[PDB]
Every structure is written in structure tokens, then in C-alpha cells.
Copies of this chain bind each other. A is one copy, B any other.
Amino acid sequence: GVLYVGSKTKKGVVHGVATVAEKTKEQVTNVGGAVVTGVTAVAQKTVEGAGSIAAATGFVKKD
């Protein structure tokens, strides 16, 4: 189809993703797709096919 984005802005201030740790052991920021930051930010994804798998996991501990 058609994806149409039109934007007029005088002033924009944007902070995307921040991970801050002090005296910490296991800290995970995990994003399955894309990370898009800005004034006027657009992300588009298309998957065409049978039996598609999208899997996102913080952490796995196995013993």
C-alpha cells in the first residue's frame, strides 16, 4: 500500500534509548526489531513466507 508521513516542526529534542547501570551484575536491553530515533522517525518491516519465526529473549541460563 502507501505509507505517507509528513511532518512540520520548529524545534525538536529527542532521546532514544538509554541503559545506565551502577554496581549492577546482569543488565540487558534487547530489541528484536530496529531502533529508530529522530524528529520524524519511521520504521517499516515486511515478512512474506509461511512458517516464519520471530523470537526475542532477554537472557537464557542453562545448566
Q: Measuring CB to CB, which residues of chain A are less than 8 angstroms from any residue of chain B?
A: 1-63
Contact = CB atoms under 8 A, between A and B. Distances in A.
A53 B50 CA distance: 10
Contacts of A32: 31-34, 54, 56
B14 A37 contact: yes
A9 B49 contact: no
Contacts of A50: 49-52
A1 B15 CA distance: 30
Given A17-B17, A39-B40, 13 more contacts: A5-B40, A9-B11, A12-B12, A12-B38, A16-B17, A16-B35, A18-B19, A38-B40, A41-B41, A42-B42, A43-B44, A44-B44, A53-B53
